[PDB]
Ligand SMILES: Nc1ncnc2c1ncn2[C@@H]1O[C@H](COP(=O)(O)OP(=O)(O)O)[C@@H](O)[C@H]1O
């Protein structure tokens with residue numbers, strides 16, 4: 001008989017799809033304030049999916065940070081659960097990089113510093129995201145220089161201090177860490193591997209690990225077989241390459257942490273260390289990167 | 304979004320009004336590449352060449 005969302009919120013257009021949820025814009029009718037409603041039909045969910053839904057709700061409530069989507073409200077009705085977020089209107093960071101045309105290391109460094117601040121906050125709260133990838137990097141608004149917002153805690157897990165455990169196989173293949181692929185016990189460092197993959201893509205516009213044979217893809221990740229080929233990497237500062245190397249370190253105990261990465265000079269001294277040169281080929285590749293993702297997403301839906 | 308799907312094919316087609324089989328082969332896994340080649344008709348509009356495929360006709364059939 002609990003219908004507070006139905007009573008007090010009005011739903012509008014869809015803003016994003018999900019495997020088992022939808023995100024629709026909504027308005028708290030009394031206040032006239034806009035939010036994003038992440039809605040799960042709970043009517044025929046399994047007990048495990050109930051647990052995962054409840055987990056995501058707890059973690060979202062727990063995370064308050066300038067670069068993390070902010071939970072405004074949470075409402076449970078008979079056959080629907082609603083997570084109500086502050087609305088972010090800047091879209092995907094990767095689409096905005098392409099739309100604004102010009103991009104340098106200095107821009108990438110400012111972007112990844114924000115991502116690292118979000119991730120550091122998750123880890124300080126005992127949360128491992130486990131799904132750091134381009135679709136989960138939003139921008140607060142269409143304002144030039146708007147903040148990056150980390151989204152989608154659907155795969156996030158709770159850890160206890162620095163203890164590692166086998167928390168399962170989850171994530172997007174191209175971003176998976178070697179320790180997960182080896183079925184080793186893992187924890188927070190899996191997020192920093194994914195940050196290294198994202199940062200690699202921010203610099204040259206294509207992924208460090210890529211193969212249509214997923215078995216070979218996983219071999220390459222587990223071997224840390226990435227490269228900085230010429231010509232595109234010839235103009236990337238040594239310090240940006242060094243930060244990538246420290247994130248894409250196979251041994252998770254030696255991989256750089258979020259706190260250490262925020263002290264990395266390419267980040268902490270961006271103004272004098274990061275190149276200000278526009279990287280036209282990076283934006284060109286990113287444009288194809290985004291098209292490949294959207295098509296590969298639209299295609300299997302049709303198959 | 305039907306405006307983003309043809310636009311995405313066009314991006315992989317390097318802005319051409321058609322896409323080639325080897326472009327789908329290069330840019331997509333061998334699965335959805337040979338999927339598309341055997342469901343994409345034939346581009347006979349402006350600028351057509353031997354092998355040109357009609358990704359817009361393949362698309363709007365769906366979205
Ligand atoms: N706070 C928000 N404001 C605006 N749009 C959002 C917000 N949260 C999510 N979305 C849109 O919905 C999409 C799916 O969000 P997400 O939480 O990842 O759902 P799922 O985990 O089910 O895919 C996002 O890519 C984004 O475009």
Ligand SMILES: [Mg+2]
Pocket residue numbers: 018019152153154155
């Ligand atoms: Mg999800």
